[PDB]
Every structure is written in structure tokens, then in C-alpha cells.
């Protein structure tokens, strides 16, 4: 299977996606601002989990591709927020000022706040040949996953844990579930959802999600290494590695009993190991 | 028409299900933060304009309160950002500190991202009994009404407009029926969506909205003056001001003169702007 291929015109097809469902529009400097920041070089990897889970269920990439929007949207005000000085302070991402740099603190803010809704305003206006439950279950599945029982949870649980000696493994594995695996979660599973899925295929997808997101925060703190709790501080090295295999070895068997429809989700699973 | 009577009641069960939407949860800390704000001592004209727009169209109470308490939530995070020292810089709101003097601007963030995804949670996952293509349109509604097209396009030409000696009527228009006018529209139309309105009674509560919120706006400019920010009477002279404001409460009531009864309140809360 060649991921980098599958990756790249799935990339490209998100971006064209991207650019055509948020236009330039008045006013012009609020629009420059949020474009500015998502439509900025990245990997795409929820809207791509997105439209890959709604295909896997039988869907059409059509019916999926609001919500995969939608779900780059979210991704991108949580990162328009997080350079803010009041939280990680970053002044540059990936060779780029921050939103906050070039367009001030209040902007950065209100881009952050426009594209959280116009997420909602493009899965609820713009998804075509869903019925309207489904849809609705898609809106209530994304905001549960931003909010204070997902994204938002593990953003301030993380921040209370800032310069803490005492941070043990259920916190850390609480931070990285809900700071970054819920998003995963309801990316697959939206997709799912859209494309009317069982819900114990959405289930086999949500444990998978949960998995390579848990495996991606693990290789990521042995990279680093290779007064903040890491999975080595807590584990040790070789343990780390071993919970990575692990993660990889439960993401694959919870997609076992597909064909070749699961194949990109199979080779991100491995992509992240090889890592 | 006992108005006092009418707003003690309805403030009551608004903060009753307010309370009741978002309990206490863990992390502790997130959901203090954002019932420190929402619970606070406020008139609720929102989710009251909800309610009796839901009532006036035929609707009940029950199935608008989700979504009337969602428009709280928006109304709470868009001041909990405009108070944090990147935009208005207050330390004290009626008398209490402010989000962010009490938790941190990190913390206000987050609260304020929180309350504006729960609100389309609560509408998504609680509205009963309206069919799910009407509770999509409030969803869409919402988001269109809270975005660019919006509150933070008011909110972004309203920064753009500070130590400006050239802001026209034009600019202030835009403002007001965007910072201000958006969120009021969408309260009313959001109730007469959920009880199945046609468009012409949407567009006849619109106006109403619209020409309150604006009335609103012209009268707090004269009372500022009576006791460089281009006003309305800085722009039109204080009797023109005065005018003006009696012409937008004279067109608010003459949008729901067809109405005998539910529309009373409605016609009570335009009387007491002008007063």
C-alpha cells in the first residue's frame, strides 16, 4: 500500500475542500486570519481519518467531506489559541508566525471562536444525502469531543499539572485520551456515523483512534529523550516501546475483519511504529 | 401587562434549567470557571426572546429551553473573551471579578471555548420532540448568527473602528445588527424554527429583533451624553438620536401588530427600552 501517495492526494483534496468551503469574504481581515491558519501546511490526518472511516462503512468521501472540513476547523482554533501567551506562548509554527503575531492577541481569538462555529455551521448546512438525525448526531458526537469532557478537559487538566512532581500514569494516560484522543475518536467515528455504520463498527474504529493516538504521544516521548512525566519517566524506555507495540498490535485487531478498505488505516497504524 | 411578573418567573426557570444543563463535573476546575460566568446575575433576555418566540409561533416552552439556555452559553463566552486582557481588559463585571482575574486568561479561554461548544451540544442532544431537520436549521442558525457573519464580524469591524475620526452610520449599523443584533435575532428565530413558524412570522420576529437591539443601542448613547467614539448622536444630533430610537420601537411592535396575546410580553419589553 503506498501510504505516502494515498496521504499526499488526500492532502490536496482537503486543502481545495478547505479553501472553497471558507472563501474570502467581508470582513476581509477576520476571513485572511482564519485562512491564514487553516490553510497553512499540515498533515490533514482528522479530516483523512474522516473521509477514510466513512468509506471503510460503505459512504462516498461527498457525503463526509463538510464534517472532514469541519474537523480541521476545530484542530486549527485549538492551535490558534494554544500559541496565545496566556497558554503555550509561541511566537512561530512549522517556520510561520502564530495567527497572534501578525494579526494580534484579539484577532487570533475571535479566528479561533469564528472557525469552532463555522465547523458546526458547515456540517449542519452543508452535508448532503445524510438524514438530519444522523447529521445531529455528528454536531452533539464533535462538541462533546471539544469541549469539557474532551479537548478542553485535558488542555486544563495538563495546565493544573505544570511543574507537579506527583503526575503518575492515569493522569498522563487522561491528558493524552482527552487532549488529543477524543478528536481522533470522533474523526473516525463521524465518519462512520455519516455513512449509517453499526455501533460496533463505530466502536471498532473509536478503540483503533484511541490506540494510534495513545501509540503516537508514547514514540513521541521516547524521540525526545532519544520535571515533566513522560511515559519513559513513569515506564522506563524499553517498557514505552513495548506499550507502543501494544497500542499498534489492539489498533489493527480492532479493524481485523476488513479488506482492503481498512488498508490506509492499517498503514498509518504502521507508519507511527516505524516512527 | 405585569412585565416585572413576567421576567421574575422566566428568569427563574431559566436559571433553574441553566443550572441544571451543566452541573458540576470533573475537571472540577473547567466547570466552576464556566458556571462562575454563567450563573452569574443577569437579565436572560435571550433565552426569555427564545422562549416567547417559541410560545408566540406554538410551540412550548419544553422543547426551545435547550436551546434557550444555549443562547446564554454563547452570550457567557462572548463575554468571558471580550473581558480578557487582549480586548476590553475589565477586572470586574456587576460588581464580581472577572473570569480571568479569578482563574487565569488560560483558564477564561477555555471556559469560554467550553460554553460555546456546549451550546450546540444542549441543542443537538436535548431538544425533544422537534423533528431533527428543524433542530439542524437552530444549529446552522446559531453557528452563522455567533461567526463571521456574526457576533465576531461586529466584534472585528468594532476593533477596526477605535481612534478612528471617519466612522459613519454605515460602520455603526454594521456594528450594532452584528456585535449586538445577530444574537437577538437568532433567539427569536430560533424559537419559531423549533415550533415550525412559515418564513414570513421568522422574518416578522427578525425585525422585531433587529429594530429592539438597535433602539436599545441609540437610547444607551443618549443616556451616556444626558449624564473620539463616533455615536449616533455624535453622527445624527441628540434629537434625531431620540427620533430615530422611537421609529425602531414603533417598527419592532408594528412587525407583530397581527398578534393579540403572546406577543403582549414582546410588545412590553419594546415599551420598556423607550422608557
Redesign the interface.
Known amino acids: 500500500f503506498d501510504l505516502k501517495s494515498y496521504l499526499k492526494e488526500r492532502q490536496r483534496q482537503v486543502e481545495a475542500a478547505l479553501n472553497a468551503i471558507l472563501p474570502p ?3 476581509p ?3 485572511e486570519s ?1 485562512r491564514y491558519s487553516l490553510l497553512a501546511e499540515g498533515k490533514r490526518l482528522r479530516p483523512i481519518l474522516c473521509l477514510a472511516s466513512c468509506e471503510l462503512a460503505g459512504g462516498t468521501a461527498a457525503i463526509a467531506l463538510p464534517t472532514a472540513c469541519a474537523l480541521e476547523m476545530v484542530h486549527t ?1 485549538s492551535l490558534i ?1 494554544d500559541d ?1 501567551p ?2 503555550d506562548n509561541d511566537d512561530f509554527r512549522r517556520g510561520r508566525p502564530t495567527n497572534h503575531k501578525v494579526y ?4 487570533a ?2 479566528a ?3 472557525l ?3 465547523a ?2 458547515a ?3 452543508h452535508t448532503p444525502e445524510v ?3 444522523r ?3 455528528v ?2 458526537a ?3 469531543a ?4 474532551g479537548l ?2 485535558g ?3 495538563d ?2 499539572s505544570e511543574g507537579r512532581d506527583d503526575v503518575n500514569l492515569e493522569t498522563l494516560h487522561y491528558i493524552h485520551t482527552h487532549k488529543t484522543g477524543a478528536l481522533l475518536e470522533v474523526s473516525v467515528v463521524s465518519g462512520a456515523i455519516l455513512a449509517g455504520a453499526s455501533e460496533e463498527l463505530q466502536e471498532q474504529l473509536r478503540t483503533y483512534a484511541q490506540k494510534i493516538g495513545l501509540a503516537f504521544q508514547v514514540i513521541d516521548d521516547i524521540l525526545d529523550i532519544t520535571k515533566k512525566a513522560t511515559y519513559p519517566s513513569l515506564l522506563g524506555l524499553d517498557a514505552s516501546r513495548e506499550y507502543a507495540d501494544q497500542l499498534i498490535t489492539e489498533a489493527k485487531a480492532a479493524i481485523a475483519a476488513f479488506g482492503a478498505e481498512a488498508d490506509p488505516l492499517r498503514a498509518i497504524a504502521d507508519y507511527i511504529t516505524a516512527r
Not at 471539544?146 to 469532557?149: F, T
Open positions: 469574504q467581508d470582513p481581515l477576520i476571513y482564519m482554533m489559541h496565545l496566556s497558554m494580534g492577541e484579539d484577532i481569538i475571535l479561533g471562536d469564528a469552532l462555529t463555522y458546526f455551521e456540517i449542519a448546512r438524514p438530519a438525525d447529521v445531529l448526531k454536531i452533539a464533535l462538541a462533546r471539544v469541549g469539557a469532557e478542553v478537559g488542555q486544563v487538566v495546565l493544573q
